[PDB]
Amino acid sequence: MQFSKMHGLGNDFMVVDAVTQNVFFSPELIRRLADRHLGVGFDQLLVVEPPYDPELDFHYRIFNADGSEVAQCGNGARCFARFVRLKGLTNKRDIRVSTANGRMVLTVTDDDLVRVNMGEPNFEPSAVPFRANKAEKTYIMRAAEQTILCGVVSMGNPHCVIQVDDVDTAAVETLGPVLESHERFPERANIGFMQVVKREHIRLRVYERGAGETQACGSGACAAVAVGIQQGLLAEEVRVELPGGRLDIAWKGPGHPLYMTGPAVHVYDGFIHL
Amino acid sequence: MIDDGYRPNVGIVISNRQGQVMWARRFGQHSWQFPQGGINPSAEQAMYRELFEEVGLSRKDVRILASTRWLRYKLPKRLVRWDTKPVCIGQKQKWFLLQLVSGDAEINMQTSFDGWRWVSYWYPVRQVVSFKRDVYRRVMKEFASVVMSL
């Protein structure tokens, strides 16, 4: 079986053409391939498939390192889109794709970046979920003796966003775990530490649900810009510098989808005889 | 021909201006497939025969862009008629990639399929009856480079 190793800003995928190949997986096999010492090594497996609607171009499916399916908007979408082009499955720069829970158009730009429609930011606390009296632009959270000012939004997953003076000095490693499992987040939260540089540029670090801090959290970048915007801090096109590199977020406010443009890298091609 | 029990057959993938392919329904059924007909006692010969006869198109209106150099599928156990001799167990197939050169109002479903429709390129690989799936994989894989050129 042929596969490709890819990553978006360090989020790494084993990518399999299940269009031109007959490929089978089990949860156990996926756990065995994800293992970084004993297998291929990856965070997620992306399986590229023929479409099941005559008007789309592909379907794709994602499994995590535990062998279970992940259904998260834009997850793996930039690696998917460059893959189908790099391997000759398509010529299009506008690629229509279905996923576990949706349907979306990916635009591959001339500089090899991919523009993803991330949907509309949802600020209502009950959708996050987030325990609160009602929606507010800013919230006070009590973290032991510390007082925290934050914004909260759902990108389909939950985010708590905290404006900081300097991401380098932010207490990601100490306050992230506190907030990540706070009682007011019944399903936990991704904790973003946003430093505003200009209205068009932020630096960001994210302590992610379950996983802590990594080089890059795409949905947390979207949540940070969405919060920064509706607190009047940011312009409608914002450059987001994460530890692992740069994303660009574009949102025109409530009533409009938010877009994320970022890179995807092909590392190597593999062959494994399952 | 007609063998090993395989029966020679031609298949037609009719491409598009935009890179779509013709998806046809089989008469009085809800199953869909590419045109495919028998080979009488050349490859190109039966394709144009099955092309004009089942789709209503002549050498005029199409142009062949590529072909395969014998793809087999076995039928499912239960569909083999062992009481008909010689025994046929499946098909050997040569496939042609065509390009519609004139227009959709010229596709005449009869003559003698039923309904037809344009469809994105890889859709037929997962849509055809199970036992034809692997043949569909290889033909669509092979033709992919040729079609994109447009």
What is A114-183 written as a DSSP string? EEEE----B--GGGTT---SS--SSEEEEETTEEEEEEEEESSSEEEEEE-S-TTTS-HHHHHHHHHT-T
Domain count, chain A: 2
Contact (Cβ atoms closer than 8 angstroms) between residue A214 and residue A223? no
Q: How far is A82 from chain B (nearest CA, A)?
A: 16
Residues of A in contact with B141 (CB under 8 A): 19-20
Does residue A229 lie within any of the structural domains?
yes
C-alpha to C-alpha distances, A205 to A81, A186, A216, nearest whole angstrom: 26, 22, 8
Cα–Cα distances (Å) from A126 to A132, A186, A209, A231, B100, in that order, read: 8, 11, 18, 20, 54
Q: Are residues A38 and A108 in the same domain?
A: yes
Active site annotation includes A73: yes
Cα–Cα distance list, B6 to A209, B54, B134 (Å): 57, 22, 16
* Pairing assessment for the beta strands A102-108 and A94-99 based on DSSP bridges: antiparallel
CATH code where residue A91 lies: 3.10.310.10
Interface residue of A57, A59, A103 to substitute, partner B, most B CBs within 10 Å: A57
Q: Check A150, A160, A217, A222 and give the catalytic one.
A: A217
Which residues have a Cβ under 8 Å from the Cβ of A174 and sit 6 or more positions away? none
Question: Residue A135, Cβ neighbours under 10 Å: how many?
Answer: 16
Residues 11-70 of A with CB under 8 A from B: 19-22, 49-58
CATH number of B1-150: 3.90.79.10
Strands B90-100 and B6-15: parallel
A123 and A227 belong to one structural domain: yes
Domain range annotation of chain B: 1-150
Max Cα-Cα span within chain A: 58
The values of phi and psi at residue A262, to 5°, are -155, 180
Closest-CA distance of chain A to residue B53, Å? 26
CA A101 to chain centre: 15
Q: How many helices (H) and strands (E) does chain A have?
A: 4, 18
Judge if A106 and A174 occupy the same domain. no
Looking at the domain assignment, is residue A3 inside a domain? yes
Is the domain of A179 the same as that of A252? yes
Give A193's Cβ-side CA count (13 Å radius): 26
Same-domain pairing of A31 and A129 = no
Domain containing residue A29: 1-114+262-274
Contact A168, A180 (CB under 8 A): no
Among candidate residues B50, B47, B39, the one with its CA nearest the CA of residue B113: B50
Q: CB distance from B78 to chain A under 8 Å?
A: no
Torsion of CA A216, A217, A220, A222, to 10 degrees: 80
CA distance A79 to A6: 6
Same domain, A78 and A99: yes
Q: How was this structure determined?
A: X-ray
In a domain, A145, yes or no: no
Determine if the peptide bond prior to A121 is cis (ω within 30°): no
Residue A128 lies in a domain: yes
